[PDB]
Amino acid sequence: LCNEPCSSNSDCIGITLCQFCKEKTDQYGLTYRTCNLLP
């Protein structure tokens, strides 16, 4: 749903109301690009 992977904003638009493709990591330090509720 909203919590899923991305590469830009548009990747998270319409699929759900979560336009904010953010960059965070897990506990390991793997930075990944994921759809968030906000910027």
Short mmCIF file of C-alpha atoms in Angstrom, two decimals:
data_model
loop_
_atom_site.label_atom_id
_atom_site.label_comp_id
_atom_site.label_asym_id
_atom_site.label_seq_id
_atom_site.Cartn_x
_atom_site.Cartn_y
_atom_site.Cartn_z
CA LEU A 1 0.00 0.00 0.00
CA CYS A 2 1.57 3.36 1.11
CA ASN A 3 4.75 1.78 2.64
CA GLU A 4 6.43 0.45 -0.61
CA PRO A 5 9.66 0.98 -2.76
CA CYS A 6 10.22 3.83 -5.35
CA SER A 7 12.74 5.84 -7.55
CA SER A 8 10.86 9.26 -7.77
CA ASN A 9 7.62 10.97 -6.49
CA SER A 10 5.37 9.82 -9.40
CA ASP A 11 6.05 6.18 -8.49
CA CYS A 12 3.90 6.67 -5.31
CA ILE A 13 1.17 8.93 -6.80
CA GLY A 14 -2.28 7.48 -7.67
CA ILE A 15 -1.24 3.90 -6.56
CA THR A 16 -2.05 5.33 -3.10
CA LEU A 17 -2.24 9.00 -1.82
CA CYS A 18 1.50 8.85 -0.74
CA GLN A 19 3.45 11.12 -3.22
CA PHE A 20 6.54 11.46 -0.96
CA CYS A 21 9.21 9.02 -2.21
CA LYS A 22 11.70 9.35 0.74
CA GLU A 23 15.23 8.06 1.37
CA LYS A 24 15.79 6.17 4.69
CA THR A 25 17.39 2.96 5.95
CA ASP A 26 16.68 -0.10 8.04
CA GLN A 27 18.86 -1.13 11.06
CA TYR A 28 21.65 -2.50 8.76
CA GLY A 29 22.43 0.85 7.03
CA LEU A 30 20.94 -0.07 3.60
CA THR A 31 19.64 3.19 2.31
CA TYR A 32 16.61 2.55 0.15
CA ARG A 33 14.00 4.77 -1.57
CA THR A 34 10.48 4.24 -0.17
CA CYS A 35 7.05 5.85 -0.49
CA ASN A 36 6.19 7.84 2.70
CA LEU A 37 3.06 9.72 3.86
CA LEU A 38 5.15 12.99 3.85
CA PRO A 39 8.49 14.61 2.75
#
